[PDB]
């Protein structure tokens, strides 16, 4: 099956680039949380960052990995600058999403087939 | 249609209205039915119903149902035949029925 | 004892199918004559691994594979489950 | 057919057929299908490689100019082994003509930097990235045009429903605009307007 | 031909000229209309709930063209500036009362321009 | 070899010698516009819209009835044809009212479709436009005959398929009225279907009336209940309601036809529906309360109660899923007294060996059947569709139908062999009446309706019928791989039910009085608080319970079929799954999730939370139920035969009768029908 | 080019929220609306989704939901493309088999035949 | 009559006009499949829509061309040589509407 | 003078009246519940029964080009009043 | 209007009152039609 890979031939260099990206984020979490005057502790923010990485951890195809890395350096490229107000950077956090019951008889107890 | 002499329905007044063939006339009907191949016997609906109008100047719906019974055919075919043809009058007329050709070289 | 019910699954055409079908043909009628109450039951195609089930004692069950076993092996197997 | 119908010309038809045929003769590598709309607009199909060579050609060669890029776009078609048709639509300045260049890609396969021919391609490509997600190799820049900064999901593609997956609102809790899973006051009533009978007999496909 | 607010009309000896035929709802480019029609006592058909969101409404004129009987017509009067987002949503009832408030108005307009349409 | 090359627009196609023109054009994708022709109805020359030109031929030929010799070249778009179509469309539109705003079919009617996509754009002929007196017929069918194009469809259908023969035409020229001449009510099973066949707005649905409109409604695949045929329906939903239900084309079942009771039961879908869980307070009344509160009460009594002294019985309309759920719940407790409303005799191992347990010759085989007797039942009403295909076979390829056990009215004029099980027993013996035809029959069929089986003679009658299938199939009856013996059912749920191991009959409960009883849609009065001793604590779980809810100690408002996406089984064994139309009203959770929650509160938990896992263990009961709209033939009839011959039960003298008789029992039966005001209206319209 | 031949199933996380896990997708060929006769609605596979609850809005009563995917439909030429787009796009699916009219033989003359039971009354 | 609705006088009193009215509103006229790019002279410069029609009633994919979407992309080079106080005039001079640019 | 609920609400020409339990009724506190005081049906019986000495007649419903489209209604059956499907105003054939 | 008079139909308002925004007289929109599903009720007689 042919393909035109993007920045990396194998998952090796993929893992390399995502390591780079996570370095960048872990650099600039404090500068942003101080920059937009967020109320979050740097530790907490960093934890949400590494969480957002862990959510996608199961991917294999290094095309997909590389594309996701493009997404990451793109959004980080927007947060390193001021182009994104306090709003969205908070919007990663969910404060105003009501807690969703994940336990069955609570779901059944309300949602009627969610 | 918009232009018609009389519509075609049975609204009322003759559900049970008595009609009976005459025994000699049953002989006649038997003679008629003998003129068709068996397995059909429905071809006689038109001549028998003719005969009905013959002994009774006009056929009530009880005559239609009655013929349908004699020949054991679904009555809707009897009503159908009664309406589709000009001879059969579904409404009473007088003893003498006057008919004139108004169309063409008579016209 | 304890057996509440016994289930079997075959398919129309396959080696396991022909084997346990033969088992049902010859053995089944007398097997059921033996025990009226136990509701042994039969179903239709499971493409491979026809196997069988036995349910009893508060839902406890055991699962054995009938794949291409002889009607002999099936015989002593069900007699094992029933015997207990 | 005289009234009420557009009069059609065969002059432009024959001419454009000749020109497309010509392009096919000179560029056997990249050219796949060269067709002429019966309303006379030449449209060329191109393998997703020679976009740079083909357009470098169509900007030059002095028997064709196409100095101006009209518009760059794409159409999201499922059912195809390659979802998208990248459609280059060009304007010939010298000859009074327009021809189209169609190329294709799936989601992962990029199309490479049409910028180096036409500067006008600069934003069209970005807009395509944001609204579709076709990646463009070594574009000078890639950012979001027409959508929110934190927004995600490449809306125009049919996988993305009419409304979004989020909404905005404000509440005195956090003193900021927030997001919640989309909730409509009205269902967006759906209509089936497609009637049977194949109003158009010509375009029919063979049944199988 | 000016386009105001959405008055329903009725025949002389008012029949609720609306037949319920759903067209005005079907061509609404903002989709904002609602029609639910239960055959009433007389056996004739009218609408139970005929609604408009003047918020969503773009004031096309399409619902004025599509009505076979000219039940709904864009009013002459622009009379507006409600104090709540509630008040801009119209029941069949509010549209009727809008139609009763002025008709010979609309009768003059339609009687003027029906030669053009 | 019995194939013919005939060109279409110069494109050859190979067709059979005697297929029509319209079919020959269907093969390559041409659909020639048409009216009176219909796939299920014999051909007629009425519509005239089917005209098509063949080159070299001066006159235009009608594509409906014209057979195709060799070498016809059929030019569809040749100018002469298009002029013919424009003409025919014009003459049709000559006399027609302008009802499209008021008319019910406006989003559908083929005069509009074919009018735009074929006929001319502007009419002519000012002075004209005849009108017709409209004629009330049934409560189901609203009738405006002015819109009639007089295309003869309704006639041919009523005659051939419906078999009533009460519709016709009276008149000539402009004036021909299509309908009953005497103003008689026309009502029958399958009669409602006529409103689908009328191509124009002449006939329409009275109860569906003016409510909806085609383009606005969202079609949804679904299945049917209330009939064991596993009928196949598509619910038309509008913004969260059910407007009406359409038969869709399925070849082995329904064809395009649907039963009437099904078609009009949707009104009864929502009338009395139960939206809330309810608990009886010590005052002596049943009131409602918090859902999980009631779940905690029932949970409590079920915790403290065990042994065979706890029971559950289901019936009427229930899925397969919740049957599994309840099964493994009460099995997960102690023991299974679980039952169904019908009595299906189990002596010769009826519960297993599904060969004798269902109808094993699918209806696609009845068209290949030759001689079919019938033991007592009323297929006209029980499983109407099945009767429809019976009349189809009998109509086209000749049949001989024998009825046993009661004179009843069938359309197709059966032979009546008398009434007595002794007659059947004497057919097992070599006694003269009939029974030589069976020896002489090629592929025979014998069908035992479960209703007549509900008598205490059940195992006896089933035994004798099995004897018939023996004396046939053993020697000269078997023509090869083939099946004969089989049974059809009434209530839709029972087949999957007893496939799951339920013990049919209420007998077990009557033997062992429970201290707890569960009810899933059981309105059968065979179980009463009168029977169940002292303090019952009986749970009724269902939707709009009329019967047994007054007896209910606890209410669990289970959802109906249009709501839940469930699994059902037709009497042939085709597994068909319903799909969601509108989520249930009020609270009304899905059944198997109610049982699931009850489990998770109980000290025993079912091994799944989700419908996928549900259907997984459903396969772990029987594998067939995960294979959809696909029937597979069983085997092992003989074994069940020797299992039947083992026990002796004398046959009672009571002459059997189908519990349904004439038309009055067709409607209000099945307990969703008792909701709809519609069914009441047509009932008291027949009683007049 | 260094094409870099690669073999794995294609999946996508670059698309919307957790709906992917819960909802099953449906594949079918919509059966002809019976109240019309014509097939042009058919011939094209479609994809629609498990529906979800709708309620009466207390101000008006229009139906309302959080079901962003409710109103989608995607027309496909062949079923292989349906399963392809379902696999690739990541959410589970269920297929229904296509059905067609069964070929028939209609002979107009059979209306009038001598001994055959088929005969058209009224025609 | 099938492309555009009839006037009411013909609508009423005449059948085919009524039908084509009713359907031409409900369903709307069907357009044969094809891909077109039309361009006109609009006061902001060349304007055009690229229509893509499945044989159907509805369109399928149509991307308008905003002259402002092109002209705006030129500020990078055009404004390179003058300070912002005249970047005002640089933006305003080429006719542009940010309602048209975005779309 | 519309039929009035026990609560005081004015029911409508399609009776919408809220039930004493329904909380939604509170939205009418301090502000009027609007309904057209003139019903439709009440104006149908208002109209006389028109009679025509012909067999089959037309209704434009208020004159040409303004009204509902033409339809010819059949008066043949005289045991009921043939009604227009648009207006609703009856017709008969005189005797 | 006096030189060319209105049609003077019977059902038109004879007031044409003001503008109802604000005040206790104000238009409030609300649902039409009739309930939906007609909930069931238990019998008042015990057992
Ligand atoms: S004018 Fe308003 S109500 Fe009429 S079609 Fe346009 S948006 Fe809809
Ligand atoms: S188009 Fe006119 S008559 Fe038809 S539903 Fe709308 S307002 Fe009523
Ligand atoms: S029958 Fe057809 S053409 Fe006639 S009014 Fe109804 S929708 Fe219109
Ligand atoms: S009533 Fe309908 S089906 Fe019967 S002839 Fe008339 S148009 Fe055809
Ligand atoms: S199909 Fe040939 S006449 Fe109607
Ligand atoms: Zn009128």
Number of domains of chain F: 4
- The tally of helices of chain G reads 2
Helix content of chain G: 10-25%
How big a fraction of the residues of chain F is strand? 15-25%
Distance between the termini of chain F: 60 Å
Small molecules bound: iron/sulfur cluster, FE2/S2 (inorganic) cluster, zinc ion
The profile of the biggest β sheet of chain F is:
7 strands, mixed
Q: Kindly report the spatial arrangement of strands forming the biggest sheet of chain G.
A: 2-1-3
- State the helix count of chain F: 20
Give the domain tally of chain G.
Answer: 1
Largest sheet of chain G: 3 strands, mixed
Strand order of the biggest β-sheet of chain F = 14-13-24-23-22-15-16
Q: What are the SSEs and their pairings?
A:
The structure is cut from a larger assembly and holds 10 protein chains of 10 kinds.
Chain B: H1 23-33, H2 45-55, H3 61-71, H4 75-84
Chain C: E1 3-9, H1 15-34, E2 41-43, E3 52-56, E4 61-64, H2 71-83
Parallel strand pairs in C: 1-2
Antiparallel strand pairs in C: 1-3, 3-4
Helix pairs in contact in C: 1-2
Chain E: E1 7-8, H1 23-26, E2 34-36, E3 49-53, H2 62-66, E4 72-73, E5 89-90, H3 92-101, H4 104-113
Bound molecules: iron/sulfur cluster (SF4) (4 copies), FE2/S2 (inorganic) cluster (FES) and zinc ion.
What does this structure look like?
This is part of a larger assembly, with ten protein chains of ten kinds. Chain B is mainly alpha-helical and 107 residues long. Chain B has a domain at 19-92. Chain B is 40% helix and 0% strand. Chain B has helices at 23-33, 45-55, 61-71, 75-84. Chain G has 123 residues and is largely without helices or strands. Chain G is built from two helices and three strands; from the N terminus they run H-E-E-H-E. Chain G has helices spanning 19-22, 79-89; strands at residues 25-28, 46-49, 93-95. Chain G has a three-stranded mixed beta sheet with strand order 2-1-3, covered by helices on one side. Chain G starts with 18 loop residues before the first helix and ends in a 28-residue tail after the last strand. Chain I is mainly beta and 95 residues long. Chain I has one domain. In chain I, the strands form two sheets. Chain I has a three-stranded mixed beta sheet, with no helix packed on it. Chain I has a two-stranded antiparallel sheet with strand order 2-3. Chains F and G meet through helix 4, strand 10 and helix 10 of F and loops of G. The structure holds iron/sulfur cluster (4 copies), FE2/S2 (inorganic) cluster and zinc ion. The PDB classes it as oxidoreductase. The entry lists the keywords NADH:ubiquinone, oxidoreductase, complex I, mammalian, mitochondrial. Entire ovine respiratory complex I. Chain A is Mitochondrial complex I, B14 subunit.
Give the gist of this structure.
It is classed as oxidoreductase. Chain B has four helices and no strands. Chain B has 107 residues and is mainly alpha-helical.
Descriptive terms for the model:
part of a larger assembly, 10 chains, H: 103 residues, alpha+beta, three-stranded antiparallel sheet, 3 strands, 22% strand, elongated, I: 95 residues, mainly beta, three-stranded mixed sheet, two-stranded antiparallel ribbon, 1 helix, 5 strands, 4% helix, binds iron/sulfur cluster, binds FE2/S2 (inorganic) cluster, binds zinc ion
């Amino acid at each position: 099956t042919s393909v035109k890979p993007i920045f990396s031939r194998d998952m090796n260099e993929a893992k390399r680039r995502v390591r780079e990206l996570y370095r960048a984020w872990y650099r600039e979490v404090p500068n942003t949380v101080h920059l937009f005057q967020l109320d979050i502790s740097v530790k907490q923010g960093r934890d949400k960052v590494r969480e957002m990485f862990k959510k996608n951890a199961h991917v294999t195809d290094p095309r997909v990995v590389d594309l996701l890395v493009i997404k990451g350096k793109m959004e980080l490229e927007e947060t390193i600058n001021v182009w994104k107000q306090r709003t969205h950077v908070m919007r990663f956090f969910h404060e105003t999403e009501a807690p969703r019951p994940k336990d069955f008889l609570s779901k059944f107890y309300v949602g009627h087939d969610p | 249609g918009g232009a018609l002499f009389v519509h075609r329905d049975t609204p009322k007044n003759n559900p049970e209205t008595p009609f009976d063939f005459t025994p000699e006339n049953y002989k006649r009907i038997e003679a008629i039915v003998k003129n068709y191949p068996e397995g059909h016997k429905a071809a006689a609906v038109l001549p028998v119903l003719d005969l009905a109008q013959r002994q009774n100047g006009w056929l009530p719906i009880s005559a239609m149902n009655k013929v349908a019974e004699i020949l054991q055919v679904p009555p809707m075919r009897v009503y159908e035949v009664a309406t589709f043809y000009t001879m059969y009058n579904r409404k009473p007329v007088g003893k003498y029925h006057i008919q004139v050709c108004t169309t063409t070289p008579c016209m | 004892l304890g057996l509440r019910e016994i289930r079997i699954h075959l398919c129309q055409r396959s080696p396991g199918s022909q084997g346990v079908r033969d088992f049902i043909e010859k053995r089944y009628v007398e097997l059921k004559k033996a025990n009226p109450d136990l509701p042994i039951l039969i179903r239709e195609c499971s493409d491979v691994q026809p196997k069988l089930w036995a349910r009893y004692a508060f839902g406890q069950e055991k699962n054995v594979s009938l794949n291409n076993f002889s009607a002999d092996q099936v015989t002593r197997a069900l007699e094992n489950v029933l015997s207990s | 057919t005289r009234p009420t119908v557009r009069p059609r010309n065969d002059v432009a038809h024959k001419q454009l057929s000749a020109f497309g045929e010509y392009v096919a003769e000179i560029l056997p590598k990249y050219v796949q299908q060269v067709q002429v709309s019966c309303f006379s607009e030449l449209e060329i199909c191109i393998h997703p490689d020679g976009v740079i060579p083909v357009l470098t050609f169509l900007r030059d060669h002095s028997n064709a100019q196409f100095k101006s890029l009209a518009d760059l776009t794409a159409v999201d078609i499922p059912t195809r082994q390659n979802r998208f048709e990248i459609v280059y639509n060009l304007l010939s300045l010298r000859f009074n003509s327009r021809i189209r260049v169609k190329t294709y890609t799936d989601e992962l396969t990029p199309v490479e930097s049409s910028v180096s021919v036409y500067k006008a391609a600069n934003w069209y490509e970005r807009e395509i990235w944001d609204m579709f997600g076709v990646f463009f190799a070594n574009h000078p820049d890639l950012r979001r045009i027409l959508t929110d900064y934190g927004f995600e999901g490449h809306p125009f593609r049919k996988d993305f429903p009419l409304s979004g997956y989020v909404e905005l609102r404000y509440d005195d809790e956090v003193k900021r605009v927030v997001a919640e899973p989309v909730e409509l006051a009205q269902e967006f009533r759906k209509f089936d307007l497609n009637s049977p009978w194949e109003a158009f007999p010509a375009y029919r496909q063979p049944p199988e | 031909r000016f386009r105001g607010e959405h008055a329903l009309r009725r025949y002389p000896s008012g029949e609720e000229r609306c037949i319920a035929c759903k067209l005005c709802e079907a061509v609404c480019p903002a989709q904002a209309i609602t029609i639910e029609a239960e055959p009433r006592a007389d056996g004739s058909r009218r609408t139970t709930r005929y609604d408009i969101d003047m918020t969503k409404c773009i004031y096309c004129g399409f619902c004025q063209e599509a009505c076979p009987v000219d039940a709904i017509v864009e009013g002459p009067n622009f009379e507006f500036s409600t104090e709540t987002h509630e008040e801009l949503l119209y029941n069949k009832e509010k549209l009727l009362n809008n139609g009763d408030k002025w008709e010979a108005e609309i009768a003059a307009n339609i009687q003027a321009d029906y030669l053009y349409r | 070899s019995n194939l013919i090359e005939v060109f279409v627009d110069g494109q050859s196609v190979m067709v059979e010698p005697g297929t029509t023109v319209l079919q020959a054009c269907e093969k390559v994708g041409m659909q020639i516009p048409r009216f009176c022709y219909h796939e299920r109805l014999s051909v007629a020359g009425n519509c005239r819209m089917c005209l098509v030109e063949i080159e070299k031929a001066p006159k235009v030929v009608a594509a409906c009835a014209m057979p195709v010799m060799k070498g016809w070249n059929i030019l569809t778009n040749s100018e002469k044809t298009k002029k013919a179509r424009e003409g025919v469309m014009e003459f049709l539109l000559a006399n027609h009212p302008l009802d499209c705003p008021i008319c019910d079919q406006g989003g559908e009617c083929d005069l509009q479709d074919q009018s735009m996509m074929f006929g001319s754009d502007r009419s002519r002929f000012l002075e004209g436009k005849r009108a017709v007196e409209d004629k009330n017929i049934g409560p189901l069918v609203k009738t405006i005959m002015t819109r009639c194009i007089q295309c003869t469809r309704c006639i041919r259908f009523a005659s051939e398929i419906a078999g009533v023969d009460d519709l016709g035409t009276t008149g000539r020229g402009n004036d021909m009225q299509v309908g009953t001449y005497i103003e008689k009510m026309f009502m029958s099973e399958l009669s409602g279907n006529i409103i689908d066949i009328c191509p124009v707005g002449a006939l329409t649905s009275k109860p569906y009336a003016f409510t909806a409109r085609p383009w606005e409604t969202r079609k949804t695949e679904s299945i049917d209940v209330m009939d064991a045929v596993g009928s196949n329906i598509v619910v038309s939903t509008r913004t969260g309601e059910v407007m009406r239900i359409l038969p869709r084309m399925h070849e082995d079942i329904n064809e395009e036809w649907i039963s009437d009771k099904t078609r009009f039961a949707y009104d009864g879908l929502k009338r009395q529906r139960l939206t809330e869980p309810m608990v009886r307070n010590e005052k002596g009344l049943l009131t409602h309360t918090t859902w999980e509160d009631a779940l905690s009460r029932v949970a409590g009594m079920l915790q403290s109660c065990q042994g065979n002294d706890v029971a559950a019985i289901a019936g009427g309309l229930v899925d397969a899923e919740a049957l599994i759920a309840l099964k493994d719940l009460l099995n997960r407790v102690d023991s299974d007294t679980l039952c169904t409303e019908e009595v299906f005799p189990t002596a010769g191992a009826g519960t297993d060996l599904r060969s004798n347990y269902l109808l094993n010759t699918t209806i696609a085989g009845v068209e290949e059947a030759d001689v079919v007797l019938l033991v007592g039942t009323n297929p006209r009403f029980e499983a109407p569709l099945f009767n429809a295909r019976i009349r189809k076979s009998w109509l086209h390829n000749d049949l001989k139908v024998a009825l046993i056990g009661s004179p009843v009215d069938l359309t197709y004029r059966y032979d009546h062999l008398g009434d007595s099980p002794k007659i059947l027993q004497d057919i097992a013996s070599g006694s003269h009446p009939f029974s030589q035809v069976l020896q002489e029959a090629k592929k025979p069929m014998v069908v035992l309706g479960s209703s007549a089986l509900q008598r205490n003679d059940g195992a006896a009658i089933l035994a004798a019928v099995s004897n018939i299938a023996q004396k046939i199939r053993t020697s000269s009856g078997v023509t090869g791989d083939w099946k004969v013996m089989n049974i059809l059912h009434r209530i839709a749920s029972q087949v999957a039910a007893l496939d799951l191991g339920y013990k049919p009959g209420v007998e077990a409960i009557r033997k062992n009085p429970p201290k707890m009883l569960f009810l899933l849609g059981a309105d059968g009065g065979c179980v009463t608080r009168q029977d169940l001793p002292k303090d019952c604590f009986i749970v009724y779980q269902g939707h709009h319970g009329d019967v047994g809810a007054p007896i209910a100690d606890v209410i669990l408002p289970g959802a109906a079929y249009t709501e839940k996406s469930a699994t059902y089984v037709n009497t042939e064994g085709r597994a068909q799954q319903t799909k969601v139309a509108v989520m249930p009203p009020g609270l009304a959770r899905e059944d198997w999730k109610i049982i699931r929650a009850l489990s998770e509160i109980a000290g025993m938990t079912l091994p799944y939370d989700t419908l996928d896992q549900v259907r997984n263990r459903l396969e772990e009961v029987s594998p067939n139920l995960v294979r959809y709209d696909d029937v597979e033939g069983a085997n092992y009839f003989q074994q069940a035969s020797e299992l039947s011959k083992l026990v002796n039960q004398q046959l009672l003298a009571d002459p059997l009768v189908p519990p349904q008789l004439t038309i009055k029992d067709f409607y209000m039966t099945d307990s969703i029908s008792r909701a709809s005001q519609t069914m009441a209206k047509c009932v008291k319209a027949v009683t007049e | 080019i260094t094409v870099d031949e690669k073999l794995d199933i294609t999946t996508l996380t670059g698309v919307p929220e957790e709906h992917i896990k819960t909802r099953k997708a449906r594949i079918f060929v919509p059966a002809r609306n019976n109240m019309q006769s014509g097939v042009n609605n058919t011939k094209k596979w479609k994809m629609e989704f498990d529906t979800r609850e709708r309620w009466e809005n207390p101000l008006m009563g229009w139906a309302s939901t959080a079901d962003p995917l409710s109103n989608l439909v995607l027309t496909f030429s062949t079923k292989e493309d349906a399963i392809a787009f379902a696999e690739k796009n990541g959410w589970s699916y269920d297929v229904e088999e296509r059905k067609v009219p069964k070929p028939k033989s209609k002979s107009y003359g059979a209306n009038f035949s001598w001994n055959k039971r088929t005969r058209v009354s009224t025609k | 009559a099938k492309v555009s609705p009839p006037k009411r006088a013909e609508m009423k009193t005449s059948m085919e006009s009524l039908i084509h009215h009713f359907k031409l509103y409900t369903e709307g006229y069907q357009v044969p499949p094809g891909a077109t790019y039309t361009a006109i002279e609009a006061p902001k410069g060349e304007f055009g829509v690229y229509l893509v029609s499945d044989g159907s009633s509805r369109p399928y994919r149509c991307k308008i061309k905003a002259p402002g979407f092109a002209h705006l992309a030129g500020l990078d080079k055009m404004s390179k040589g003058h300070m912002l106080a005249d970047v005002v005039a640089i933006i305003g001079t080429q006719d542009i509407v940010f309602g048209e640019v975005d779309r | 003078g519309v039929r009035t609920s026990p609560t005081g609400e004015k029911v409508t020409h399609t009776g919408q009246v809220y039930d004493d339990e329904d909380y939604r009724r509170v939205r009418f506190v301090g502000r009027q519940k609007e309904v057209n005081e003139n019903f439709a049906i009440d104006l149908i019986a208002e109209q006389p029964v028109s009679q025509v000495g012909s067999r089959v007649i037309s209704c434009d419903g208020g004159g040409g080009a303004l009204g509902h489209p033409r339809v010819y209604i059949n008066l043949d059956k005289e045991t009921k009043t043939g009604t227009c499907g648009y207006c609703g105003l009856q017709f008969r054939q005189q005797h | 209007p006096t030189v060319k008079p209105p049609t003077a139909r019977k059902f038109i308002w004879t007031n044409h009152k003001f503008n109802l925004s604000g005040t206790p007289q104000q238009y409030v929109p609300y649902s039409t039609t009739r309930k939906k599903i007609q909930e069931w009720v238990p019998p008042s007689t015990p057992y």
